[PDB]
Structure formats: structure tokens, C-alpha cells
Amino acid sequence: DDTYAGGQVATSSNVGFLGSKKFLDTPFNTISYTDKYIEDKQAKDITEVIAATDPSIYTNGASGGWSENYYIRGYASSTNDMSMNGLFGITPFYRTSPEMFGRVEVLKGPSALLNGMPPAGSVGGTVNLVTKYAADEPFARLTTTYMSDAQFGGHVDVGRRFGENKEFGVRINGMYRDGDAAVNDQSKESRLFSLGLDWQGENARVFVDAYDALDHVDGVTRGVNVSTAVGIPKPPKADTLLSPDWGSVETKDKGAMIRGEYDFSDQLMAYAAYGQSTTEYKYNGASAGTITSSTGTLSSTLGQLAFDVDKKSADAGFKGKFETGSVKHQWVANATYYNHTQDDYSYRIIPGFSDPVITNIYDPNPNWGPKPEFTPPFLFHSTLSTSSFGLADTLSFAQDKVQLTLGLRHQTVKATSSVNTLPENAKSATTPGVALLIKATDKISVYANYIEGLTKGDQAPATASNPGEIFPPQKTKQQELGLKVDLGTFAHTLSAFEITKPSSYLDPSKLVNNLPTFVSDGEQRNRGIEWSFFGSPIEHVRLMGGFTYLDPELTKTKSGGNDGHTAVAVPKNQAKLGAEWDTQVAQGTLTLSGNINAVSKQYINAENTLSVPGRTLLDVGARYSTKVEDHPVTFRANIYNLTNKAYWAQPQLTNLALGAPRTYMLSVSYDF
């Protein structure tokens, strides 16, 4: 079995191009969630999977935003930067419904050695989505879903293997759901069709995945801005929508990939992966609300955006083992390629609709005005290309009890834009990694790593002493020290880390030829301690979660103005706890569940003069699983934000947004 006691977490995960590694063999803080856990949470997106019990992950928790939004180790981790089966550029751009995945894997911290630079250059962590393939036994499950107030849905999952040796597999997933959600005047529509094909040969293997997805929100949440002069007013009740009720966002995503492996011997393997995807995004609504008085007056400017992006992606390489003296080597060498082309259509100012719409956030009957026709004109075409070449070796001493991993990767990046007159060139950087793992016993591992993340370099403006200079890719740097303990059915991780991340800015205090200079002297430093755990500490009980302390400090900022201040948006303290308790009832198993998610305050600006308080959220759940004439049936009921706590937290692009209100979810599932 791959799965740990309880069924919710897997025992191994993909560690970029080092491939599959077990929990106690992995000198990084990783976790992998099963499809069972996904169905048990009734998760509708990736955030609801990876944020529920992990204290190193934070979301502002808004309902029906234009994308998912989460941080890992106190840094942004962009939805653009998820991998599928280890390959970037395939998954949906902004929001991914998790019906098509057998695992959701999280690797905490930056990982450029392992993965290369993902398209948006975030460095918080890597989320890897592993698709489903057909199990040996024919399989068909139908599930009907409900989410308050009036969203109804279904999901069908069928699988079957063919050939004399079941060497071919086919796995199909289909999902649709539609209707009013828990926020007033907001509705959500989701559609997925997916396909997982595989062929197992004697010396060779091929895996194909393709999918078609739709995500649509009417009454999309955009959030709102505040100033120090006016203040942050008390949050309205939690089901309030503070963006136009006619506003909407729609993302269509299509993707396909193929992987191939060829075993030359038991010591040498080649592999290749190729994929492509398409994203069509449209948005019509507020570009931002602004709170203009302490009585709750709100001023919302309107904007429109569409973009189309075509992506291509590849990763090919060789893996091998050999021995020298009493040292075992496991090596890999790979090359990656990513390219996208993009068209952007946009109104900054919409004709007829440049006067902002004036409301009050506490109003039960806001007048949002008419809905402008959607006609954004073409603005610019843009491209992004990346490529990389990586080498690594894992050396093992003393019967596999000491493992030293060394490697490096060369990374190249180039961006173009059809409205940029400044020069456009590729830039490169070399990023090393080293990680040490010691097995004290066969139940206890201690580990340390140094590893980097990469972000494309900014370009100096025409106003600067160094006008049009393009910086090389910028290096985020992690040191980590950790301890892992597997007691058998229950496991612990304790880790400490320090991660520095640079930023770049125009600096009026460093004059060259009497002009401001563009520099990469900016720095944020996140130090943290994480204690987390999972599994079944007693019979019939499951328990997952942990506690983190995080110190996310702006150590160097423009002019020194904000030196020593705390980073925006993320909390310093998190405690999360998910529990499940099983009990035999009639002809089936009843499970009760509860979650608590407690966080401390967050700063809203880098001056640290505005903040929002901490908050504690509770969720409860019941689940009944039985057979009806010998067919497995599972009934599920959940309530999220049970106390209907109203809270502000920080999303992308704007200062504040309301967290999701109390939400009920029901589902029933039936195996044929």
C-alpha cells in the first residue's frame, strides 16, 4: 500500500526530478493527500485540500474570488505554478477542482534545483497534482453534491483495464455543478471532463492525461481598499457581497500531457514528458472598491479584462544508479522547456462607466448600476520562455542510513511584450542545492537542506541611471533543519527554516549620473518553526494538523522606510486541528469530524499602521458509510465556518475581502 494509517495521507511523494521518495527518506517537509481525503472534505478546490489542516499554509479564505489564493511558509504560491504529474504549465490557470486527482502533494519551501522555475516565479512551495489511473478492478462511482444555498452537482468516475495482462488502462471523470452559493447574489458553475490513459509494458511505460474545465462565478469577489486616514471599518455580516452583483468571471482551461519511460537496464532509465494547455479568462466587474468613509461608504471603479494564453511544456532526462566502494549513487540529469503566448484585452477605463459606483458596505439593497457590455479591446501580445538543465546525485553511506543529495540547475528566462520599446534578452542563473538526511533509527530521520527559488528579473525603467537593464533571475534562499518521527500509525514533523527573498526597486538615494538607480537590494526574510502531525494516534481516531510560528520581516526596503516591519497579509501564529472519530452503528460506520483553524493578526500595509485581528474558525462533519444490497454507499454532511464569523483578510491586488460565510455541504456517493 502507498497510504498511511487512516487512508487520508500517502507515505511518499514526488520530489521534483529526484522522483518518488518515502516520508522518512525525504529531506524536505512534504505531505501528500489522497483522493479519499478530498472526497471526505467535499473539497471544491485545491485550497480546501491543502489549507485545512496545514499550519504552514494560509489563505484569506474568500468565497468566489477570481482565483485561489494561498501562501506557503509565508510567501505567495501562485496557482500558475502547480505541476501535474511533475510537469508545469498544464493545470488550470487560476482555480482547479480536484476530482481528477489521486493525490495532492505539497512540498514546502522553494525548489528550483528540483523543479526548475515555474511560470510565475513564486517560491513558497510546490503543489503537485497526481492524476488518477485505472485500478485493476473495474470501477464506477456516481456522486450527487449540494452546497448552500442552491448549488447542485454531480461527479461520475469510471475505470477499467484492457488486454490479456491488464496492461492498458482507461479512467474517466466527469463533473458538473451549478447554482447560488453561500454569499448573497453569487453563483458558481464548474465543469470538468478528464481522461487518464496508461500502458504498462515490460521495459516501458506510457501515461496520457487530458482534461477540459470550466470555472464561472457570477457575483465574483474582488475586495476593497482602505487608507490610514479613513480606517478599516467593522466587517459586515459574512454573506455580504462587496463587489457588483452583475460582475462575473469565467476561465476555460484545456490541457493534455504524455509521459514515457524506458528501462535500458535496472541501472539506467530514460524519461520524457510533453504537454500543452490553453487558458481563456474573462472578467467584467469592479477593478477595486475603496472605502472612503468610516460610515462604510464604498467607491468601486469598473474594469474589464480578457486574456488567452497557449502554453507548451517539456521535461526529458536520464536516471541511474551505481556503486563505488561502499557508496551508492542515484543520479539524474534533465532538461526542461516552457513557452507561452498570450493576448491581453483590457479597459482600464470603460467608456460610459468611468465614474465609480457609490454604495455603502452595510447596505442591504445596494444599487450597482447597469452591467456594461463586455467589449475589451486588444492591448498587447506577450511571451514567456524558460529552459533549464539540471544534474543531481544522491549518495548513500552506511546501508542507506546517511543520504547526501547534491545538485545544480542552469535556468534561462526571456519575456517579450509587443508594447515594450525597451530591450528584450534572455537571462540566466545557476542554482545549487544540497540536502542531508540521517536515519537515527528506522522510525526517526533528521535532515537539513539548502535550496533556492527563482523569479524572473525585473527591468529598470527609462527614468533610471541604468535604464533598461534586465536583472538575472533572482534567488530566494532557504536553510532548513528538521526532524521526522513515524511511530507506526501516527507521525510527527518538526522543522525550522529561514528563507530570504529579494525584491527590486527604483532607489532615489543612490544617484548615478544624478539619476535614481534600479537595484535588487530589497529583502524579506521569513523565519519559522513548524510542528505538524498526521495519522491515527488511537484506534478509531484520526488526527491531523499542527502549530507554526512565523517571523516574516522586511529587512531591506526602499529608503529604509519600512525596515524591520512585518510583511503584509500573513499571520505570525497558526494552529490547526482536524479530528475524526469512528463508531459502529447498525450496518455501517459513522464518522464524526471537527476542525479548528486559529490564526493571529495580519498587517494590511507594509508601514504596519493598519491591521486586522486574528480569528478562529470551526467546521464540523458527519459521514456514514454502508452497503445497500452490497454496493458501497457514503453519505456526507459538512458545515464550514460554523459560527458564521465575519472577518476581513487580505487577497491579491486589493487590501481586504470578506472570508467565506457559513456553508453547508451534502453529498451521496454510490459504487456500481
Residue numbers in the entry: 32 to 703
Provide the authors' original text about this structure.
The A. baumannii outer-membrane transporter protein, BauA, that recognises this siderophore has itself been identified as a vaccine candidate. The siderophore is known to be bound from the medium by the integral outer-membrane BauA protein. BauA has the typical outer-membrane TonB-dependent transporter (TBDT) fold with a β-barrel formed by 22 antiparallel strands, several extracellular loops, and a plug domain folded inside of the barrel. Acinetobactin is synthesized as a precursor, preacinetobactin, which rearranges non-enzymatically and irreversibly at pH >7 to give acinetobactin.
Residues 33 to 703 of the protein are well defined in the electron density map, while the N-terminal region comprising the TonB box is missing, presumably because it is flexible. Compared to the other TBDTs, the extracellular loops of the β-barrel form a large open cavity bordered by mainly short and apolar amino acids giving large access to the loops NL1-NL3 of the plug domain. The asymmetric unit contains three monomers arranged around a threefold symmetry axis reminiscent of the porin arrangement and thus plausibly biologically meaningful. PISA, a computational assessment of oligomeric state in the crystal, suggests a trimer with a high degree of confidence. Biophysical methods (gel filtration and light scattering) do not support a trimeric assembly. Size Exclusion Chromatography coupled to Multi-Angle Light Scattering (SEC-MALS) analysis in C8E4 is consistent with monomer whilst native gel shows the protein runs more closely to a dimer; however, the detergent bound to the protein may increase the apparent weight suggesting a monomer in solution.
